[PDB]
Structures are given as structure tokens and as C-alpha cells.
Design a protein around this nucleic acid. Structure first.
Lengths: 67, 67, 53, 73
RNA sequence: AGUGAUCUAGAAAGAGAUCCACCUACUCAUGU
């Protein structure tokens, strides 16, 4: 449904915004990223928040809790 | 407003951050979509309680009522 | 339908129960305003309890 | 629903439906008018006392009007 | 100077993966 001219104007105003704000791009996380294990323990406390109170566990929930 | 009337707990006193005076009253109601969602949530509490203990029905009512 | 011999004590219960809570809420104000606009004796009771406080 | 306040039915709300009342609730113009009045009076007088003919009454009336005019500057 | 406005209500057989907030928490140098 998107015409090419719409797509080029979208990309043009996004380049215009991200350069008007001098936005440096998000890097790929390095091998030795500084805050890395804190990001990991946040992403895993986000996952155990489902599995702290429930009792009935199927194959996939038990498998990911083991992960 | 013609007559400034002190009103219910559901009104908000909008202090002007320039002159430090209550200059508008924002009146609150709960939106009809959220009222229907709460009704559907209590209906789900009734419907998932096929054969459920009475204390768990009470705890579901307390959870949805506090929420 | 409380007679005059307890209305000051009722206003004191309203005061001392407004002060239990963490912050001030408008509920006690709306309450007290309707109580004052009902009858003259409640207005004299709030006069006497502000002076008392 | 007495006074149009209460429910359609007590059945449906699962309440008692016990609705209870809340205990918490110009000079020139004037001159002209005067002149007119005078004229009218004159006419009346004429009608009363010997003035079947128009010329007489009209004459007298005219005279009166003139007098009035004279009086008011 | 205020009255007054009060639904429900239980028996038989059958059914039914439950899935979530009510206790706080940090200061020795024996000497030179």
C-alpha cells in the first residue's frame, strides 16, 4: 500500500530528524560491553516475573525456566 | 464558571505554575471503555471460577478491586 | 440526628479522622461544607472547634 | 421511580432501590400635547354650545391654536 | 428543622486445569 514517494519522504524526514538531533546510532553491544550483566539480569528478572507465583507449568514454560 | 463551587473528590485543582493560583477545575470520570473492561474482568472472575475455592474468588475480587 | 450536646465532639471526630491519613483529601472539606450549610448549629460548632484547635 | 429519581426496577441493579433524599442539598413635545388638549377642549365646548356649523368652531379653534403658539415662543 | 422511597430468599439431576502483592534493613591508627 505504500508508494515509493511516500517511502522516500518518510526516510527523508527520519534522516532530517536524526541529523537535526545529532543522533549517534546505537552500536552493536560489544564482547566487553560495560553494563552488560546488569542488562542481562534485568532481562531475566523480566522473565521470572511471570514464573514467580504460578504452579502449573507446561513443557515450554518449564523449558524456558530451565533456560 | 458562573459560581465557583467547591466540588467532589473527583475534581482536580489545576494550579497555574505562573501565578500559583487554582485557575481551572479538571473533572474526572472513568471512561466507558474501561468500565466495560472492568465488567468483563469481573465476568472473567466469575467464569474461570468453575470449581474454585471461596477464598480464591475473594482474592480475585480483591485483586481486581484494588487494581 | 445528633443533638447539640455531641455536635462539637462529632466535629472533633471529623478533625481527628482527617488527620489520620497521610495527606489531606478533599472528602473532609466537602463533608464539612455540607454540614455547615445544613444548619446554624454545625456552623457554630466549626467556629468553636477552629478556636479550640 | 418516585419523582423520576429511582430505578426502572429493583430487579436488575441487585440493590434495594431505597432511594432516600439527601440531607446535604421632551419639552416641545409636552407643549404640543398641551396645545392638542386645549384644542380638543375647545372642540368639546363648541359641540356643547351652539356650533352646528363648522366654520365657527374651526375659526375659534384656529385662534386658540395661534394663541398657544404665541405663548410658547 | 430534618419525616418519607428497603430487590433478594431454594430443591433435583448434571456439569468444572484456575491463571497474578499483606513486614525495614549499615559507623579505628600499634608505632614512626
Amino acid at each position: 500500500e505504500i508508494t515509493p514517494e511516500e517511502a522516500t519522504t518518510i526516510f527523508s524526514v527520519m534522516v532530517e530528524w536524526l541529523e537535526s538531533r545529532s543522533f549517534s546510532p546505537i552500536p552493536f553491544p560489544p564482547l566487553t560491553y560495560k553494563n552488560d550483566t546488569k542488562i542481562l539480569v534485568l532481562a531475566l528478572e523480566d522473565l521470572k516475573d511471570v514464573y514467580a507465583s504460578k504452579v502449573r507449568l507446561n513443557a515450554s514454560e518449564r523449558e524456558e525456566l530451565a533456560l | 464558571m458562573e459560581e465557583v463551587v467547591s466540588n467532589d473528590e473527583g475534581v482536580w485543582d489545576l494550579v497555574d505554575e505562573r501565578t500559583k493560583q487554582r485557575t481551572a477545575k479538571a473533572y474526572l470520570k472513568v471512561s466507558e471503555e474501561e468500565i466495560k473492561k472492568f465488567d468483563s474482568r469481573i465476568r472473567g472472575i466469575l467464569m474461570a471460577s468453575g470449581s474454585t475455592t471461596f477464598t480464591k474468588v475473594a482474592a480475585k475480587w480483591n485483586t481486581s478491586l484494588i487494581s | 440526628k445528633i443533638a447539640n450536646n455531641l455536635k462539637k465532639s462529632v466535629v472533633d471526630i471529623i478533625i481527628k479522622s482527617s488527620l489520620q491519613e497521610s495527606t489531606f483529601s478533599k472528602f473532609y472539606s466537602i463533608l464539612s461544607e455540607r454540614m455547615i450549610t445544613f444548619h446554624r448549629s454545625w456552623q457554630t460548632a466549626y467556629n468553636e472547634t477552629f478556636e479550640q484547635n | 421511580s418516585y419523582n423520576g429519581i429511582g430505578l426502572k426496577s429493583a430487579k436488575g441493579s441487585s440493590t434495594s432501590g431505597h432511594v432516600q433524599r439527601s440531607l446535604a442539598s421632551i419639552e416641545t413635545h409636552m407643549e404640543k400635547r398641551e396645545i392638542e388638549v386645549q384644542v380638543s377642549e375647545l372642540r368639546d365646548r363648541l359641540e356643547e354650545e351652539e356650533t352646528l356649523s363648522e366654520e365657527q368652531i374651526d375659526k375659534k379653534c384656529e385662534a386658540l391654536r395661534a394663541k398657544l403658539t404665541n405663548e410658547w415662543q
